[PDB]
């Protein structure tokens, strides 16, 4: 229906938004486009469904997630793929775990904020009956 379109429509506004403002962070700069090909060869052999900040955009515009709930589920992949595959005591590798539980936190940390309980509800119902 037209409220059910306008429900997801400001989902996708909403997802937007906190995702532009992880993006801008620069904290974050490692995990806002695709690991590179060229500067590491093996991250495609390694991780079997990678995930980036520009991927989740282009996920929220082609209507991937209906709930707040199926975005996180990224995030959360984002920062899982970070956690494997930088597992070493070495500097760089704790430092981008670090970098990736802080974008993990503080997504959730906004979502707690600024997401409305019921909406999600909302959302998570029509997603359900169809
Ligand atoms: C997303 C991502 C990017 C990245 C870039 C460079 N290096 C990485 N890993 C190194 C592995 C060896 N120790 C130093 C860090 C990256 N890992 C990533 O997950």
Redesign the pocket.
């Known amino acids: 229906s037209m409220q059910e379109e306008d429900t997801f429509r400001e989902l996708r506004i909403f997802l937007r938004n906190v995702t532009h403002r992880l993006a801008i962070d620069k904290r974050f700069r ?2 806002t486009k695709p ?1 590179d090909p060229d ?2 060869p093996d ?1 495609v052999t390694v991780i079997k469904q990678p995930m980036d900040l520009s991927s989740v955009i282009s996920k929220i515009d082609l209507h991937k997630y209906l709930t707040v709930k199926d975005y996180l589920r990224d995030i959360d992949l984002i920062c899982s ?2 956690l494997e ?2 597992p ?1 005591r ?1 500097p ?2 704790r430092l ?1 775990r670090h970098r990736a539980c802080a974008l993990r936190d503080t997504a959730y940390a906004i979502i707690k904020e600024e997401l409305d309980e019921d909406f999600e509800q909302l959302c998570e119902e029509i997603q359900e009956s169809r």
């Open positions: 490692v995990f690991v500067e590491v991250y793929n970070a595959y930088n070493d070495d760089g590798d981008i």
